[PDB]
Nucleic acid binder design. Structure first.
Ligand SMILES: Nc1nc2c(ncn2[C@@H]2O[C@H](COP(=O)(O)OP(=O)(O)OP(=O)(O)O)[C@@H](O)[C@H]2O)c(=O)[nH]1
Ligand SMILES: [Mg+2]
Ligand SMILES: [Mg+2]
Ligand SMILES: [Mg+2]
Ligand SMILES: [Mg+2]
Ligand SMILES: [Mg+2]
Ligand SMILES: [Mg+2]
Ligand SMILES: [Mg+2]
Ligand SMILES: [Mg+2]
Ligand SMILES: [Mg+2]
Ligand SMILES: [Mg+2]
Ligand SMILES: [Mg+2]
Ligand SMILES: [Mg+2]
Ligand SMILES: [Mg+2]
Ligand SMILES: [Mg+2]
Ligand SMILES: [Mg+2]
Ligand SMILES: [Mg+2]
Lengths: 139, 117, 176, 45, 41, 205, 26, 191, 97
RNA sequence: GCUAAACCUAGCCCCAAACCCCACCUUACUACCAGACAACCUUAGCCAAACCAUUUACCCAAAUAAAGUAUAGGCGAUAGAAAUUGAAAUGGCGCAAUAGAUAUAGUACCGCAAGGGAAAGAUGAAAAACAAGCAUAAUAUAGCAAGGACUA
RNA sequence: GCUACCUAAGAACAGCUAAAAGAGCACACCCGUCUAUGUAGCAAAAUAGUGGGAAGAUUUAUAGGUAGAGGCGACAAACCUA
RNA sequence: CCUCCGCAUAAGCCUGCGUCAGAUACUGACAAUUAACAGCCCAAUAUCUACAAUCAACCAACAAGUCAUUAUUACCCUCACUGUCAACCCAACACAGGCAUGCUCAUAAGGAAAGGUUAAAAAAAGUAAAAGGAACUCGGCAAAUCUUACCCC
């Protein structure tokens, strides 16, 4: 969970349990070639790799073999009309390696006007012989 | 020289970059030799329920009737949870009806709240 | 399985995906705590799928099919969170009389401003906490001048706003 | 020969003009108060 | 700017009209036109 | 020593749907009449108009046609909009911009009569006219470029009107030109039609 | 903008005079 | 929205709206009389009559209402003509485009008299709030699915499984799911 | 080019709005009301210059005396500086002496 | 005919009235360890005295008057009471984009820092419709460039 | 965060001659004797050549300290953000 | 043809020549840096620790120096978090300047002095020079050679 105060744990205390997870993750297509067993996620910045492993194993029953995370810096170079820098948000990227020889490949997602089209068909472009003379007149 | 950009862990020298974090909650401690001891109880355990056979869905049919919002109140909860038993026993020590004097001794204390979410 | 991060394969490529209505607070208030617990994860899986769809649409430079699904799911999750928070607040008020889940206190910081300092969890008492004792929760007399200056700045801003409002109102009355 | 008097180092920057040092003395507290009154986006360095 | 002059165009033209037949900037720029128009008069 | 003063840097950095379109026409002809049984459509227009006379319609059609062409003569787009359909107005007035036209009407040759009628709902009436008219189209510079202003010509036209079915009326929708129609009047000025432009690697063939 | 009406009126009159001189009516 | 944003015919978030009102524009604000929400009497779909301008007298149906500028768009009425699809070569197609009309320039129409009427928001015992025409009385009425695989049925959505109890969601779910925790939460210091 | 190319919007003045129509009424409150009220009591304005007049230095002194305690910090600082400057100007500068 | 020029409201000024989820003192915006250090203290000077050295008006708890009086003072520049008296209570002969707030903003930018600190916009009911400088048009013996003139 | 000096803990100094050197020649490195260029410059003090030191009182990265009726100074009244 | 360099670490900067689409290394969108390297440590109470380094052995020293533990009492959970890009930083600049360290000692790495033409003066730099060899000049400045002896401080 994020934006919440974690109950402080003292030695011998109970297990920390989160019942309504606040973490929402994205499964993103890798920008570079990755191993067949590697899945790329965009993660909230406050989520650990252990948290991500438990999240995937509990909510999705996905057998996870390894998790690696990195924080991607978002560009702060863009400037608005007032010359004030626009910050692209930073985000965490997690690489999850599936267990038991399982393989994953990002799915291939994404596999009046009539009047306008009919008039475009009926344009009747002016012929060169007409020499710019309007053709509407029947004479 | 950059005063406006946010101070992150990508900016200072090696010590600064190692020391500062990104808000991720701690999982354990560091012993001699910088060996990190991870405490299992510190790791949030996701209490994910069994969704098999569940009938609800992320969306609700538009055919559902409109209703008036009635935010739950302490009085309403007391009336709907305590008033029946109180009335029955009065017609016929508040702990018997559900009251708990001290939150201490509970796994889930209501104040100071000691559970996640 | 990872397939749950993506919509049904039949819906891939569809220009529009038919979706119901976001759960309302009143509708959720009738559900049991276990039912809300399960609905939370149902909505969480839906939200993850929709966020994946949005990111993939951005990557492919294509419009997201039925973007209002994400808004509906976010609204439903917010309503569920509000319902659970209302139940917790009612129970806390009944059993303790506290209107706030987290302890705190009104304190005057080093700048003389009154703030709601939210307490933090510590293992040692405050009088032994070196960093907490370093923190200062009082304002010395030299802050009074700046407090007055800030008050007068606020007063000037408010007076300007009210005067401008009256000028605009009179102009409107003259116009109409 | 001159001009490059600034030799950046975040340790020196924070230790010399940081929030902690400004609050460490009443004069620095008044500096922060002046910046707040002026409305500075960056109160400290 | 309680009281601001609004006739300066015509005040300038009163001299530039006499300066129109001079050579160079003396017929356009008032600073130069006024000196030469006074000499002309 | 006096240090140099930099000017501010900004001075040298400056740089240079619940509502839907309510159409009132169609993109052409529902059923093209081919020149050398419409009682269903006649009834379909009667039931919505409540007052109409096919026997008297051709006179109104001719009046609307002539008055619209006069409005073209005076470039009276305000009246032309009511006289002709929106599908027709661009054809009426686009190529005629920046040039004066001296269109005029003279006695018709044979009485105008309806041909066929078809049919959210748009009326449609095809009327055959065999009239006599005059043209003289000038340039921006007022020099004749088409037709004699005095000599009239015989014109056979198949004018199709359309109507909106609440406050709409019968307006020129489109003129049907049969493939067998005689070629129009020749133009005064000669024309050149360049051949296929040739890239260096390309050869004429 | 400078508050006033007399200078604007005078300038309008001069503009009218210049326009007439440049393109006198038939 | 940016301060003093000039509401136009295009919706406040469309591509055309962004093109017309980029973030840096500072045009003069448009003066609009302050008609209260309880006094607005024109609604989408209401039959109205145009009082001024071209097509004055003709009655149409309000298609859109830009409340922020006291505007009502009468479908197919008060129309100019604009070209759509005009490219480098094609002249485009003429289209009748409506222009917004002020509520002072437009008046409601009696449901049956089919004549302009002045209106009042008189309370009625049954229709707590409803319009009433003044010159001739009568109330002008206010004008105006298959579940998917991921849509809850109405009965399931309306089922009341909630039994009010003095248990938090956390402990209730713990009991339901059988999670057993014996460790006692040691007390912490708050400050 | 410092001249507007269009006539400014016409300025319509209602000479018979209530303010103008009733302007001056009760100016003779004193001599026509047994001197119960002085005409200066009809003056509405700053508390420190109701029925009183003086040059800038006197006005500033009166303002500081009468509402100085209620003035804002920087406004009071500016008033003190203005009084000081006006004292120096009127008591040490000028053509006549 | 180019560069341009033009605008009217964004706002501001003076008064009256009225009192006004999470993170963040460690390297701030950093979930989570043995404290302890805690604050108060005559303003000065410029300047006037034609130098300067004593001296030189300054939120004071009711306007007016006593009164610039009594007094003070290198008895000089200047400073200056009190007793006593006891009044009243709705906007603009303000600015209108070089003005009015610095403010579109304490932003951009400048400085290590404290700090300094800008500029600018103008269509419409609907966009879902005449400065300078030059060019047109380089130049003719000789001269503060014009005046008297002249058919020129 | 320059610079003067200092504190903590670091680092660099080829090769030859000599022998344990505030030694000699000479790289890197530090400096800046003279000439030329440059002078709104590549540069608000630079470039090329020439030259002084180059195992020492050397040079130097890092963090810290001394603050203006003061600091620091192998006194040049030098340096303390052109 | 040049190579002063170059590749990495540190410090600094913060997406700043990756892809796509548009304008005229710019704009918008999309992507990306994955820990083993590095940072981020240590349960207490006492108690311990004279004998440099220099191939550490002779030897020589002076300026006399960076490298250490025990005795009890506690103690098992164990791999979290953060840096990871670039043609880059300080000099207003895409500035001939400044920038610590390891390897490379001329390179396997990195680069281009000439936009095209002509070959006037004047100007800068460089090469060559008959005979002479400081006669120049304030002065052998500069250049070329590799050149003695002495005075003042
Ligand atoms: N002198 C002056 N009069 C003001 C000012 N603001 C408001 N007023 C006057 O206050 C009176 C009432 O103002 P309105 O806005 O008409 O009414 P309101 O809101 O009940 O007034 P308030 O109670 O003063 O807020 C009028 O006579 C105004 O002219 C101001 O700044 N100065
Ligand atoms: Mg990492
Ligand atoms: Mg340095
Ligand atoms: Mg003096
Ligand atoms: Mg301004
Ligand atoms: Mg001009
Ligand atoms: Mg050596
Ligand atoms: Mg030596
Ligand atoms: Mg000396
Ligand atoms: Mg000296
Ligand atoms: Mg080159
Ligand atoms: Mg060249
Ligand atoms: Mg020779
Ligand atoms: Mg000799
Ligand atoms: Mg000689
Ligand atoms: Mg000689
Ligand atoms: Mg020499």
């Amino acid at each position: 969970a994020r934006n919440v105060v974690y109950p402080l744990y003292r030695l011998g205390g109970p297990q920390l349990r989160v019942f309504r997870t606040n973490f929402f993750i994205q499964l993103v297509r890798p920008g570079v070639a990755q191993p067949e067993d590697t899945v790329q996620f965009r993660i909230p910045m406050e989520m650990t790799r252990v948290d991500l492993r438990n999240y995937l194993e509990g909510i999705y029953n996905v057998p996870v073999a390894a998790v690696r995370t990195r924080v991607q810096h978002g560009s702060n170079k863009r400037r608005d009309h007032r010359n004030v820098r626009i910050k692209k948000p930073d985000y965490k990227v997690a690489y999850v390696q599936l267990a038991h020889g399982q393989t994953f490949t990002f799915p291939d997602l994404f596999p009046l006007y009539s009047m306008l089209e009919e008039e475009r068909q009926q344009r009747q472009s002016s012929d060169p012989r007409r020499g710019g003379v309007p053709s509407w007149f029947g004479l | 020289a950059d005063r406006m950009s946010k101070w992150t862990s990508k900016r200072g020298p090696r010590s600064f970059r190692g020391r500062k974090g990104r808000g991720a909650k701690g999982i354990g401690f560091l012993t001699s030799g910088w060996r990190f001891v991870q405490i299992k109880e510190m790791v949030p355990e996701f209490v994910v329920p069994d969704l098999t056979g569940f009938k609800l869905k992320p969306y609700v049919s538009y055919l559902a009737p409109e209703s008036e919002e009635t935010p739950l109140t302490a009085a309403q909860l007391f009336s709907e949870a305590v008033a029946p038993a109180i009335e029955k026993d009065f017609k016929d020590n508040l702990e018997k009806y559900g009251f708990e004097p001290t939150q201490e001794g509970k796994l889930f204390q209501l104040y100071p709240r000691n559970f996640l979410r | 399985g990872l397939e749950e991060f993506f919509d049904d394969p039949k819906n891939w490529g569809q220009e529009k995906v038919k979706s119901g209505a976001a759960w309302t607070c009143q509708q959720l208030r009738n559900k049991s705590n276990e039912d809300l617990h399960k609905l939370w994860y149902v909505l969480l899986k839906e939200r993850n799928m929709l966020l994946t769809l949005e990111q993939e649409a951005k990557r492919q430079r294509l419009p997201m099919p039925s973007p209002e699904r994400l808004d509906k799911v976010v609204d439903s999750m917010d309503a569920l969170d509000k319902v659970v928070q209302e139940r917790e607040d009612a129970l806390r008020l009944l059993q303790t009389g506290q209107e706030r889940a987290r302890p705190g206190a009104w304190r005057r910081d080093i700048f003389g401003r009154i703030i709601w300092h939210k307490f933090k969890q510590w293992v040692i008492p405050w009088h032994l906490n070196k960093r907490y004792n370093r923190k200062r929760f009082f304002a010395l007399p030299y802050v009074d001048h700046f407090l007055r200056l800030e008050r007068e700045k606020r007063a000037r801003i408010k007076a300007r706003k009210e005067n401008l409002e009256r000028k605009k109102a009179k102009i409107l009355l003259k116009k109409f | 020969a001159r001009g490059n008097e600034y030799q950046p180092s975040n340790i020196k920057r924070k230790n010399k003009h940081g929030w902690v040092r400004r609050l460490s003395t009443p004069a620095g507290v008044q500096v922060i108060l002046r910046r707040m009154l002026k409305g500075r986006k960056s109160l400290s360095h | 700017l309680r009281n601001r002059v609004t006739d300066r165009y015509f005040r300038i033209q009163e001299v530039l009209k006499h300066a129109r037949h001079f050579r160079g900037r003396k017929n356009r720029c008032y600073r130069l036109a006024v000196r030469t128009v006074i000499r002309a008069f | 020593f006096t240090p140099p003063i930099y000017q501010p840097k900004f001075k040298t950095e400056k740089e240079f749907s619940d509502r839907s379109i309510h159409l009132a026409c169609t993109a052409g002809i529902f059923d093209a009449y081919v020149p050398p049984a419409s009682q269903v459509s006649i009834r379909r227009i009667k039931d919505y108009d409540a007052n109409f006379k096919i026997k008297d319609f051709p006179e109104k059609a001719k009046d609307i046609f002539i008055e619209a062409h006069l409005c073209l003569n005076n470039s009276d787009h305000d009246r032309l909009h009511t006289l002709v359909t929106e599908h027709c107005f661009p054809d009426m007035t686009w190529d005629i911009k920046y040039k004066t036209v001296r269109w005029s009407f003279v006695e018709s040759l044979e009485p105008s009569h309806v041909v066929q009628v078809r049919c959210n709902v748009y009326g449609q009436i095809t009327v055959r006219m065999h009239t006599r008219q005059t043209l003289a189209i000038y340039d921006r510079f007022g020099r004749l470029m088409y037709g004699q202003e005095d000599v009239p010509k015989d014109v056979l036209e198949y004018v199709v009107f359309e109507k909106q079915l609440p406050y709409g009326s019968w307006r020129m929708h489109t003129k049907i030109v049969p493939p067998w129609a005689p070629p129009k009047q020749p133009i005064l000025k000669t024309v050149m039609i360049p051949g296929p432009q040739l890239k260096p690697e390309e050869e004429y063939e | 903008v400078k508050k006033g009406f007399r200078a604007a009126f005078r300038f309008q009159k001069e503009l009218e005079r210049q326009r007439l001189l440049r393109c006198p009516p038939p | 929205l940016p301060p003093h944003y000039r509401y136009g015919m295009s919706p406040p978030g469309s591509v055309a709206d962004k093109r017309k009102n980029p973030p840096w524009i500072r045009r003069r604000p448009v003066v609009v009389e302050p008609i209260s929400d309880e006094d607005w009497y024109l609604f989408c779909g209401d039959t109205v009559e145009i009082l001024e301008g071209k097509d004055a007298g003709k009655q149409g149906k309000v298609v859109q209402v830009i409340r922020q500028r006291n505007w009502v768009v009468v479908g197919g009425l008060n129309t100019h003509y604009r070209y759509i699809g005009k490219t480098m070569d094609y002249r485009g197609t003429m289209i009748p485009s409506e222009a917004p009309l002020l509520h002072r320039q437009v008046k409601l129409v009696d449901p049956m008299d089919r004549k302009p009427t002045e209106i009042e928001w008189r309370f009625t015992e049954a229709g707590e709030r409803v319009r009433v025409s003044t010159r001739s009385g009568r109330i002008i009425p206010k004008p105006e699915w298959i579940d998917g695989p991921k849509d809850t049925s109405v009965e399931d959505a309306l089922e009341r499984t909630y039994v009010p109890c003095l248990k938090t969601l956390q402990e209730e779910v713990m009991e339901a799911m059988g999670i057993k925790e014996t460790r006692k939460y040691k007390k912490v210091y708050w400050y | 080019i410092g001249i507007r190319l269009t006539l400014p919007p016409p300025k319509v003045v209602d000479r018979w709005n209530e303010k103008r129509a009733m302007f001056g009424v009760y100016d003779n409150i004193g001599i026509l009301g047994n001197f119960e009220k002085h005409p200066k009591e009809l003056i509405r304005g700053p508390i420190w210059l109701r029925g009183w007049k003086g040059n800038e230095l006197q006005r500033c002194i009166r303002k500081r005396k009468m509402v100085g305690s209620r003035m804002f910090a920087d406004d009071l600082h500016n008033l003190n500086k203005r009084i000081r400057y006006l004292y120096k100007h009127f008591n040490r500068h000028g053509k006549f002496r």
